[PDB]
Design a protein around this motif. Sequence first.
Motif, PDB file in Angstrom:
ATOM      1  N   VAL C  17       0.845  -1.182   0.000  1.00  0.00           N
ATOM      2  CA  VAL C  17       0.000   0.000   0.000  1.00  0.00           C
ATOM      3  C   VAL C  17       0.882   1.234   0.000  1.00  0.00           C
ATOM      4  CG1 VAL C  17      -1.703   1.318   1.243  1.00  0.00           C
ATOM      5  CG2 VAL C  17      -1.898  -1.147   1.128  1.00  0.00           C
ATOM      6  N   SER C  19       1.620   4.695   0.948  1.00  0.00           N
ATOM      7  CA  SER C  19       1.219   5.702   1.908  1.00  0.00           C
ATOM      8  C   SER C  19       1.810   7.032   1.483  1.00  0.00           C
ATOM      9  CB  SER C  19       1.690   5.330   3.309  1.00  0.00           C
ATOM     10  OG  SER C  19       1.077   4.134   3.742  1.00  0.00           O
ATOM     11  N   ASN C  21       0.699  11.161   0.889  1.00  0.00           N
ATOM     12  CA  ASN C  21      -0.294  12.153   1.312  1.00  0.00           C
ATOM     13  C   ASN C  21      -1.295  11.554   2.297  1.00  0.00           C
ATOM     14  OD1 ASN C  21      -1.912  14.882  -0.538  1.00  0.00           O
ATOM     15  ND2 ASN C  21      -1.538  14.577   1.646  1.00  0.00           N
ATOM     16  N   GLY C  22      -0.832  10.625   3.122  1.00  0.00           N
ATOM     17  CA  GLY C  22      -1.693   9.948   4.057  1.00  0.00           C
ATOM     18  C   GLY C  22      -2.688   8.991   3.460  1.00  0.00           C
ATOM     19  N   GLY C  23      -2.686   8.810   2.150  1.00  0.00           N
ATOM     20  CA  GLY C  23      -3.644   7.952   1.504  1.00  0.00           C
ATOM     21  C   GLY C  23      -3.324   6.501   1.768  1.00  0.00           C
ATOM     22  N   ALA C  24      -4.304   5.650   1.500  1.00  0.00           N
ATOM     23  CA  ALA C  24      -4.129   4.209   1.599  1.00  0.00           C
ATOM     24  C   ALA C  24      -4.313   3.644   0.203  1.00  0.00           C
ATOM     25  CB  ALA C  24      -5.129   3.600   2.569  1.00  0.00           C
ATOM     26  N   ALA C 243       4.084  11.478  11.496  1.00  0.00           N
ATOM     27  CA  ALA C 243       2.687  11.867  11.334  1.00  0.00           C
ATOM     28  C   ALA C 243       2.406  13.207  11.977  1.00  0.00           C
ATOM     29  CB  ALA C 243       1.780  10.808  11.943  1.00  0.00           C
ATOM     30  N   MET C 246       3.905  15.779   9.155  1.00  0.00           N
ATOM     31  CA  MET C 246       3.035  15.717   7.992  1.00  0.00           C
ATOM     32  C   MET C 246       1.632  16.164   8.361  1.00  0.00           C
ATOM     33  SD  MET C 246       5.078  14.735   5.552  1.00  0.00           S
ATOM     34  CE  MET C 246       6.449  15.518   6.387  1.00  0.00           C
ATOM     35  N   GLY C 247       1.216  15.885   9.597  1.00  0.00           N
ATOM     36  CA  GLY C 247       0.015  16.504  10.121  1.00  0.00           C
ATOM     37  C   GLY C 247       0.189  17.986  10.382  1.00  0.00           C
TER      38      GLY C 247
ATOM     39  N   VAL D  68      -9.660   6.390   2.050  1.00  0.00           N
ATOM     40  CA  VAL D  68      -9.751   6.977   3.375  1.00  0.00           C
ATOM     41  C   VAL D  68     -10.355   8.365   3.243  1.00  0.00           C
ATOM     42  CG1 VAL D  68      -7.900   5.584   4.241  1.00  0.00           C
ATOM     43  CG2 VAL D  68      -7.343   7.767   3.242  1.00  0.00           C
ATOM     44  N   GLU D 169      -4.186  16.217  16.126  1.00  0.00           N
ATOM     45  CA  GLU D 169      -4.448  16.242  14.681  1.00  0.00           C
ATOM     46  C   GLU D 169      -3.380  15.493  13.880  1.00  0.00           C
ATOM     47  N   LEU D 171      -1.788  12.754  11.270  1.00  0.00           N
ATOM     48  CA  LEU D 171      -2.142  12.222   9.971  1.00  0.00           C
ATOM     49  C   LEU D 171      -2.008  10.703  10.007  1.00  0.00           C
ATOM     50  CD1 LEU D 171      -1.051  13.894   6.691  1.00  0.00           C
ATOM     51  CD2 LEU D 171      -0.490  11.556   7.035  1.00  0.00           C
ATOM     52  N   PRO D 172      -3.103   9.949   9.834  1.00  0.00           N
ATOM     53  CA  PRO D 172      -3.092   8.506  10.131  1.00  0.00           C
ATOM     54  C   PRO D 172      -2.217   7.655   9.230  1.00  0.00           C
ATOM     55  CG  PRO D 172      -5.311   9.363  10.177  1.00  0.00           C
ATOM     56  CD  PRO D 172      -4.462  10.444   9.591  1.00  0.00           C
ATOM     57  N   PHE D 174      -0.689   3.787   7.931  1.00  0.00           N
ATOM     58  CA  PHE D 174      -0.976   2.386   7.695  1.00  0.00           C
ATOM     59  C   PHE D 174       0.275   1.571   7.436  1.00  0.00           C
ATOM     60  CE2 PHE D 174      -5.580   2.756   6.063  1.00  0.00           C
ATOM     61  CZ  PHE D 174      -5.984   3.018   7.351  1.00  0.00           C
ATOM     62  N   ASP D 176       2.178  -1.564   5.571  1.00  0.00           N
ATOM     63  CA  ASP D 176       2.204  -1.745   4.134  1.00  0.00           C
ATOM     64  C   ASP D 176       1.921  -3.175   3.708  1.00  0.00           C
ATOM     65  OD1 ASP D 176       2.779   0.904   4.053  1.00  0.00           O
ATOM     66  OD2 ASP D 176       4.953   0.594   4.052  1.00  0.00           O
TER      67      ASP D 176
END
Lengths: 293, 215, 447, 267, 244, 204
Positions: C17, C19, C21-24, C243, C246-247, D68, D169, D171-172, D174, D176
């Motif tokens: 996966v 990761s 821009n925080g995307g999945a 995080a 990036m957050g 997401v 706040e 940024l989540p 995951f 891999d």
Amino acid sequence: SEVITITKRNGAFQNSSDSQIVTPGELVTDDPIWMRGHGTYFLDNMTYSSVAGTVSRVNRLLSVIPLKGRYAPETGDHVVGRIAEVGNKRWKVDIGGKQHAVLMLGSVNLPGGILRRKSESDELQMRSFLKEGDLLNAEVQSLFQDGSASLHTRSLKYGKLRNGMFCQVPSSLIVRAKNHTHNLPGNITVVLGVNGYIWLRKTSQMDLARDTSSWQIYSDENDPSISNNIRQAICRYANVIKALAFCEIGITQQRIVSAYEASMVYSNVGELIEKNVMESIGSDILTAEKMRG
Amino acid sequence: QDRRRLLGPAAAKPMAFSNTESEQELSLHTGFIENCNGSALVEARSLGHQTSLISAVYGPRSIRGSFTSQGTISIQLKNGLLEKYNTNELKEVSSFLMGIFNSVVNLSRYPKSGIDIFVYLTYDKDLTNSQISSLIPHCITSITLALADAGIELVDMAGAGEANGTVVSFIKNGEEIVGFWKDDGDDEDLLECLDRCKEQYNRYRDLMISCLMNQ
Amino acid sequence: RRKRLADGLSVTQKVFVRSRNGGATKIVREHYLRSDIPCLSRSCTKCPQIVVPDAQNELPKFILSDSPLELSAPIGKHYVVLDTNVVLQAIDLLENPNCFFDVIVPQIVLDEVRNKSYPVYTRLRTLCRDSDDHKRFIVFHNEFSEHTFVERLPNETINDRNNRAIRKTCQWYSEHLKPYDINVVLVTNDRLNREAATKEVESNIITKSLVQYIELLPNADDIRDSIPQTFSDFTFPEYYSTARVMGGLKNGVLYQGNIQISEYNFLEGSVSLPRFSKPVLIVGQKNLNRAFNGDQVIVELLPQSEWKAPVISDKQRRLLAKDAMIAQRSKKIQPTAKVVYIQRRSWRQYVGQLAPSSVDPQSSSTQNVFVILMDKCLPKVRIRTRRAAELLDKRIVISIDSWPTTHKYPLGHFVRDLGTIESAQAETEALLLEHDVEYRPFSKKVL
Amino acid sequence: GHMSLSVAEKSYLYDSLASTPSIRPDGRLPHQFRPIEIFTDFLPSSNGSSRIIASDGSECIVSIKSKVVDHHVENELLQVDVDIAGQRDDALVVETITSLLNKVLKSGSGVDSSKLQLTKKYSFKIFVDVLVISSHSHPISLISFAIYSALNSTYLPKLISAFDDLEVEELPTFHDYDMVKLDINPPLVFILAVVGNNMLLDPAANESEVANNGLIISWSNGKITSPIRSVALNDSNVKSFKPHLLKQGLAMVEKYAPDVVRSLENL
Amino acid sequence: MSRLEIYSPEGLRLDGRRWNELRRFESSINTHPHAADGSSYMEQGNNKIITLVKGPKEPRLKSQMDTSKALLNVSVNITKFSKFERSKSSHKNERRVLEIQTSLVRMFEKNVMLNIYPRTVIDIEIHVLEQDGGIMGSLINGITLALIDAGISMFDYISGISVGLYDTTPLLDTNSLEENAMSTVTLGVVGKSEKLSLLLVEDKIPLDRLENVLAIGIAGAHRVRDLMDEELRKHAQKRVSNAS
Amino acid sequence: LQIREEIPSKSWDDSVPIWVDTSTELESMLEDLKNTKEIAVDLEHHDYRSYYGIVCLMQISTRERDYLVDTLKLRENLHILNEVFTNPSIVKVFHGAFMNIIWLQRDLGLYVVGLFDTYHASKAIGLPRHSLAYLLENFANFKTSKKYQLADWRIRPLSKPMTAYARADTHFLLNIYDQLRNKLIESNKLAGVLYESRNVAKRR
RNA sequence: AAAAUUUAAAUUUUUUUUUUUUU
């Protein structure tokens, strides 16, 4: 004692006598003496197939018969038409083949017969005798320049269907014989088209007449007297058709009788839909084919 | 954008704002559109909610397609001014509409003839401080009055009654049901869902026949 | 699972996966193994049987000699296979001309470098092609290699299969190098990776650490100061997590740019931000937070309690950040900032001089010395070293190793042995490189 | 519709099925369905895939892609989007079936969106993306079935960091490789039909043609639920209906429903 | 600047392929007997296509009819799940797609013996499922199945393949990662010949490579219609051996 | 009809299939099986070298001991096995017990009453793979032999891993009947399991 | 030695605007 077949297989898109078998783009030979017919094109020697099929060498004629394609119409054949359209004094009607057959206005059996002669008011009543989607017995007359052919009903025996049910199959498994109307114990009758269209109905007196009123040749009526013992016996012959169709079986009239008596294991007629059991009865007859003839 | 209309300059935006058993009631009127042959007018107002909508008839129009034995119905739901129901939300109702009238209309009286039905969800108040489901039965009533105005062969004044997110359409003074629609609600409240729908149906059809026989 | 092609050739799916821009974002690839993977050496006679030309129609060159540095049995002749970490710790040790002439680069080791650092990845890309008669570097594509490929085991992290495949990578090697008795030496720094081979778990394998390899050289005295590496008055803070920054970036919380730390005031510096007009000072030794001058960092504004006149929520800070631009228009009390993360170190190789206080004359052993740098703005570096009595009146090259929490001055290591202080040749040399002048002769791929 | 049949059949077909010892054209028991095939997990670019095969050769595949999202700025956490081969976007049977399954999978009606919830601020937008190759039926109750397996064939990447982004706040993040299956209780849909005084289950196209009227009943969670719609199949034979027959079919569905479910709840 | 490794100096690609190598190539025949007499399935790597053919048969309207030959309709279905990133809007009149809809027609105006199928309709249905780059030549190889899948009259095999160019070096069978990385050309190649059906270049190409570049793909393309053939033939043996 | 906990079969090295070489050890089973209220069953058949059919092998097992029935001349002497096998107190645990009975019914006409099905009964509760390759994997911890099962058992003595594989397949269906004798009472599908067992042993 | 013998190919109109896919 079930409702549905739910068997599961997850993680896959799919589960995964000698003669010349030729491809398109392929050379057969370049002996000039051979003649070049169907499935064949060429450049002055180079014999080139065009389909997936078999080399047929007939005595000087080489031609390629394919394996896959629609029904080929030929004259004198006994098939079943579904009414597509109505034309000027013409009708359009599906064979299942490439195109529709055509059917002249006076090509049909008139009620009262020939004593009813011609009339121009008959084209004002094309929809009277015929309309869309309807099923009938038809006799293949002759063709056009392309390969599209026409029909007619030159008998009482040909005509619009009733008293039963339709089913359909691939055209391949239907075997050719000198006869096509067949009468089966259970007081019922198969009308095997050649093209792959199959009508069942109850045996009539005219059917009984084959082996020993006339104003009802466009009716939507049936015999009102239809028992369920007729009706449920229809379905038992109905599924065993698709059993042989799923099992890729050439239809013998006797094989159907052999299919019917082998189906007497199961009185639950709804159990005649099983992929295995149709194959099992399909396996029965092929083993039973290895005894008689 | 769309080269066929006037939609303004693109970078504009519309204006924004933030926070700083009851009776239903009708007013039913026909014969007011001269394009059509069947018109019907419906006012509705109930407790936080006021609704007005127009049902329009064009028939029998010719069919350029082919032969049919009988008639064919065509139904359009279109947003009016304020309330905007979703596009796919519309046609589902249009599907649900046609099923009932196919137990109503003598299509066999009308070979090769078309039926055009235009429904204008013209204006609705919802001042209350399944939002389309609250407007179903009034459509059928609004159609029936316009279809009486074109004078087409109709078996019954069929109507639907509503009970709390549930729509049930009747005939024969409720002794049969012709159209069923259910959203979330309770479980096995059906027997009460028979009743409150039925009596509104018992109310509404009487209101309808008053609108015509007294005219 | 995996599937087979009719060429005996394997095909399977590597899937992950993305990761970004925080995307999945699930990414799937097919993967191939081949069976024509060359061992690329002099002595073997069968991997040169399988070598096939490229699109430019060339069969490449098999350069690792039959003759390495041979050592004390049970080493004998040996080759060296590395850790990324020993490269990440000792990248300049590799660039010693005096040693390490024959190293296989594993593909996964190649990738973690490409994962970690881009211009460090240049250097291994530099060294392998610019391997010579003396020093020979290959890259073995072991996960393109069928006979060294492994999978993800059940209940596994990605780190486990990394060490296991490298272990698997070495496992094929000596097997192919049994016929010539040239061994293969796996170098690591990881104590848990120095635990599983203590029992000699599957392979009778050469698992030595860096120093455990370094202590077996004939000339290891010259090179052990190129080995990388209380001391406390208070505790320095740390840098924000991944995080967190990036957050921080999207919300307008965090800012990056460049910083200038003054020489006339070592403990004060400002940045030039894109949102901000004036140079925004960062005051305080803890607020500089052990970064060096010129680096790319990530800063946070300070509250008005720490603003200077010449909360939990970021709901407060943004409204305070608006008040900064008001105070920027004041020029009477102007805001202060501090760093919270370092976007990038601008580290490189560095040249300086040592302190005579830091060295003992009578000692011959290892000791701490600090290096006075040629850069006036950058502080001294504690250097734990032996030969300081030698190098005190001599110029030196170091490289910074790390900054852990406690150390007021960082851990680094001496790299290159230059020459005598105010000798004309040595003072010619560092005048080039500290002015960024290339001087090295044209290599084998140049000519 | 699809087919054009003949009138003499249409009587006999309406005769035989309206028998009091009711008779199907294939002669199943009145509550039976037809044999099918169910494949999944074959589009490895997707969060989940599905592939289902009818007896008449009707054919569909439903895809699962996720995404997401902030679950506060968006209301619909779950989206259905349908394609039928051979048809325009503008057509009727397209849009109604399309708008239907959205209602069937409202976010807290039979959908357990807490299982979709990622953080206190974020969650998972899902896409029920549907491609029907062919149908000869009112295709809908087939289409739910593959989706049920599709949700039972869907894995999702694992949360690493924390989930309270009001103050900090974050940024989540995951992992891999580590995916977890979506735990979910998806609903099911069943097509019904009323002929005379008989109620068949799984109407085939011939059975679907001759019917007076038909139903769609939403099954979820081991019970009957909404959305429920009376539904026309043809429009040449549309007749009304006694309500107890409507009351009859519900348990007639229900006392055979979970056996179909358990046949598919079978792993 | 790409943080990755395009093509190794050691001769290797992303999965380790050489410049003259293919993906896994799988076809199938009669995948959908109940649907149409042309039904064939493609896997060329992760490019996965369902290919469907209807005909030769009656039109829907007598307007759309000729008294000389057949017609050919192309309907392409790109799903919104075809890629990694899910596309927002639909494609059904997208001018990018219509080009290909034009393209396959003129590519296949001239294999079909059009005269011997007059007054009838050929409709070719496309279902793009999983997309892996090399997308154009992926289609054509699926087509060549599907016409033979009903056994329609034709002349020849027709092969298709995208071959890419990293700076000097040809790349047989690129992927979409490599497609966005360099310049690519797709070739619609006919049979065993050196004559072309399709030739399409979007990217910018220096002239001087191009003759050599064109000289590459033929050996690939010949190995394509190679692997199509036997794979049909082993199917073709499976019929009559168990039919008879 | 009373469920118990999961009782697996005995230890794999603690037993080899002690085959019945004549009428003596064939009588050893009918004395041993006439005491147990539960039995595991299996069979093997070759449809090649006979028209009436010769069942190539058979496996009959108690809770500890498994047999290998030599049915060449004892095809006509398999009529004594029903002395315990036609009993209502003893279920006969087999996976698809039709051709295990019907080939013993084609030549020997054997009395069939009260066998416990393991193949299709696994599908109803929801054990998905009815094959003996799964039940030896999931419930017996074994490996299957697929090309050897196509091979026949017409001659004797048999191969020892081949007699270890189908006996593991006999330990498979018995452990596909171990928890199936447990979990059947829970999910309300056990009443159909006896009638389906009644449908197999009745009609011929 | 006369006498004569055979065919037949199909016609006149129903539809919804173009973004937007990872140096």
